[PDB]
Amino acid sequence: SGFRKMAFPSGKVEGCMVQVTCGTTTLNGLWLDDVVYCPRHVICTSEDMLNPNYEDLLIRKSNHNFLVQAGNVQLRVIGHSMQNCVLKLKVDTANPKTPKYKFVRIQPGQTFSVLACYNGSPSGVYQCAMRPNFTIKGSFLNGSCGSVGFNIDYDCVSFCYMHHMELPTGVHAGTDLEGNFYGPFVDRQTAQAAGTDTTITVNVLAWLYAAVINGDRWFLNRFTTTLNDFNLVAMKYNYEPLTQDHVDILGPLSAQTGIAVLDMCASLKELLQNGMNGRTILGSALLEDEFTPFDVVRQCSGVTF
Amino acid sequence: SGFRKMAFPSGKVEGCMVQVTCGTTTLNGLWLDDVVYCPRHVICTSEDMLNPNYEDLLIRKSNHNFLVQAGNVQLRVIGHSMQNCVLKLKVDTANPKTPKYKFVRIQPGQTFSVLACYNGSPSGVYQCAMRPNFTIKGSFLNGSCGSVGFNIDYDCVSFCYMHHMELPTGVHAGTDLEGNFYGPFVDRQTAQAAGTDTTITVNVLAWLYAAVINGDRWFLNRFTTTLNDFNLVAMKYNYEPLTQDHVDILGPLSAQTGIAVLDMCASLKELLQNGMNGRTILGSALLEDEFTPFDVVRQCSG
Numbered sequence: 001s002g003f004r005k006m007a008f009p010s011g012k013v014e015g016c017m018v019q020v021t022c023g024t025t026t027l028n029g030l031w032l033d034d035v036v037y038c039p040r041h042v043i044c045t046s047e048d049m050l051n052p053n054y055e056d057l058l059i060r061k062s063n064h065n066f067l068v069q070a071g072n073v074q075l076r077v078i079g080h081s082m083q084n085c086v087l088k089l090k091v092d093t094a095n096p097k098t099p100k101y102k103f104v105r106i107q108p109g110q111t112f113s114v115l116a117c118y119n120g121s122p123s124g125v126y127q128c129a130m131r132p133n134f135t136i137k138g139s140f141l142n143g144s145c146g147s148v149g150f151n152i153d154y155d156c157v158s159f160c161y162m163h164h165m166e167l168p169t170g171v172h173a174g175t176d177l178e179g180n181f182y183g184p185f186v187d188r189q190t191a192q193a194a195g196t197d198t199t200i201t202v203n204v205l206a207w208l209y210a211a212v213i214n215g216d217r218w219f220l221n222r223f224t225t226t227l228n229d230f231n232l233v234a235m236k237y238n239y240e241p242l243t244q245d246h247v248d249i250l251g252p253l254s255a256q257t258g259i260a261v262l263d264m265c266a267s268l269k270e271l272l273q274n275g276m277n278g279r280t281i282l283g284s285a286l287l288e289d290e291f292t293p294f295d296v297v298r299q300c301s302g303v304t305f
Numbered sequence: 306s307g308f309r310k311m312a313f314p315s316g317k318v319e320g321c322m323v324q325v326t327c328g329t330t331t332l333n334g335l336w337l338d339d340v341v342y343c344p345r346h347v348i349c350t351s352e353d354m355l356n357p358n359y360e361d362l363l364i365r366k367s368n369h370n371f372l373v374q375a376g377n378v379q380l381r382v383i384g385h386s387m388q389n390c391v392l393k394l395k396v397d398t399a400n401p402k403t404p405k406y407k408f409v410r411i412q413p414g415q416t417f418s419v420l421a422c423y424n425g426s427p428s429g430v431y432q433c434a435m436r437p438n439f440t441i442k443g444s445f446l447n448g449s450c451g452s453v454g455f456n457i458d459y460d461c462v463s464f465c466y467m468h469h470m471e472l473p474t475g476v477h478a479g480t481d482l483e484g485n486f487y488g489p490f491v492d493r494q495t496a497q498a499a500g501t502d503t504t505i506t507v508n509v510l511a512w513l514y515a516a517v518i519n520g521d522r523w524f525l526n527r528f529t530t531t532l533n534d535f536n537l538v539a540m541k542y543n544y545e546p547l548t549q550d551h552v553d554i555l556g557p558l559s560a561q562t563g564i565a566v567l568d569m570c571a572s573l574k575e576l577l578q579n580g581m582n583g584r585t586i587l588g589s590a591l592l593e594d595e596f597t598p599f600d601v602v603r604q605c606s607g
């Protein structure tokens with residue numbers, strides 16, 4: 001029993017974290033095989049950030065300008081190239097701790113674990129979701145750039161996020177490991193704002209199934225709804241539309257608990273229109289949307305890595 | 306900016322997780338140097354749950370009855386001893402991945418990370434607090450026994466908890482790494498119940514300081530209170546008494562935000578009286594009590 005916000009074990013990623021220093025800037029890098037990946041803004045000054053020409057800034061740099069440190073060992077940079085908003089520093093040594101890995105781009109609503117790092121040293125791990133507005137509600141301080149987000153499937157680490165910046169509202173923006181930003185963000189000091197966020201409907205439904213599996217049933221009702229009527233109500237409450245794909249993904253949880261997805265949708269509709277009335281679900285007075293259906297199945301069945 | 310429930314990176318503990326099998330029972334063990342620590346109930350059968358005599362059950366066992374597996378390598382048990390509710394299995398190989406470590410017994414309100422494991426394999430990492438009733442609200446299934454709780458301040462792992470059992474209400478009980486249970490619990494299937502749980506007041510106050518540091522001030526008020534008047538109010542909401550130790554511990558956060566502890570206590574009294582009125586604090590509609598003053602300082606300042 002119990003349902004916690006749970007991250008993947010971070011060990012495979014910890015053995016990849018290195019510190020990258022360029023001039024006065026120090027941030028984190030991801031050391032996989034003989035390449036160190038890090039945000040390209042490490043080559044910027046405070047002035048450069050206002051209007052940066054990264055090809056021009058990078059061409060002026062030499063390999064010895066990049067100081068890479070893996071623990072207490074300085075790595076030798078033997079090449080440098082840029083791929084979108086990520087800098088790739090070729091090093092002379094392949095990381096002996098390189099796990100089986102892939103670079104994957106996640107969709108909004110998908111969750112992942114973040115290994116927050118400072119000076120190439122892991123300090124914490126937390127689970128979060130890629131918001132529908134492409135930001136993440138992380139917890140990051142100065143020096144956390146280059147910290148990565150990942151999932152584990154079997155013994156393979158799928159790297160899906162690299163931290164680049166904090167927006168004025170305190171939310172975070174970054175890229176996949178190919179340097180493509182999630183969202184309409186750019187790595188330049190200019191006016192940028194997160195769009196209005198919405199609730200990840202499929203994830204709230206998955207969390208209501210987790211609550212039922214854990215014995216919390218007060219919100220269940222005798223009713224069902226059509227997918228179209230549910231989506232009309234979802235649009236009204238700034239909830240993401242629920243697709244037939246989402247309904248299909250929730251199938252196993254529906255089969256296990258005996259609550260059809262549209263029956264759970266009718267519970268969610270009543271919760272949106274009437275509130276919780278002083279009650280809680282899994283120790284929360286708000287509907288939680290940072291557990292995917294896969295996360296609920298994984299946690300309620302005990303899959304290991 | 307931002308405030309998340311954050312666990313320590315679990316790598317140093319992952320390299321210590323092994324599978325321990327004794328008869329039909331399989332659970333997790335912690336492999337440090339040449340010793341594997343695990344719950345002593347791994348030696349129990351069906352009739353040895355209601356009233357087990359662990360000394361008598363252990364004396365009947367030989368080293369070859371304990372099957373220890375570290376990855377895909379079977380470890381050889383060369384000795385066994387019991388220390389309170391933990392079984393210590395001496396093995397013929399020292400764990401090469403043994404980090405710098407300590408065994409620390411914690412107090413209620415303290416937080417720690419749990420590396421939940423099944424069959425010696427880590428499945429997830431989450432953050433817990435030792436409840437005032439000495440239980441933990443973990444997330445554990447059958448086979449999670451032997452999973453450990455830890456903190457990693459510096460490069461040293463302080464092991465503080467080993468999971469032993471789930472109580473009828475779905476909460477969890479366990480021991481420190483010396484086998485001493487937290488709380489009035491025993492490793493017997495006898496009728497046991499968690500006492501009435503209370504809110505960790507000092508932790509809620511720390512989390513209100515984290516909210517102020519993060520820019521949230523709506524709950525602040527112009528009132529202060531005496532420590533005794535605060536305790537008389539807070540007890541009525543099943544909150545733990547706030548001691549002078551707790552007030553002292555909150556000093557650095559009070560100095561940083563400019564809000565005296567008793568001034569923050571008056572905000573907490575008002576939040577208990579009024580509720581949140583549709584508002585949230587750090588993305589929560591409930592007062593959070595699983596961040597200590599130490600966690601808040603570390604997460605907010607470094």
Ligand SMILES: O=C(Nc1cncc2ccccc12)[C@@H]1CCOc2cc(Cl)c(Cl)cc21
Nearest residue numbers: 001346445446447449469470471492493494
């Ligand atoms: O609690 C137990 N293991 C579990 C742990 N955590 C979570 C669980 C969730 C579901 C089912 C088992 C779970 C075992 C088996 C059941 O009976 C006992 C009894 C005693 Cl006295 C002791 Cl010390 C251990 C156990």
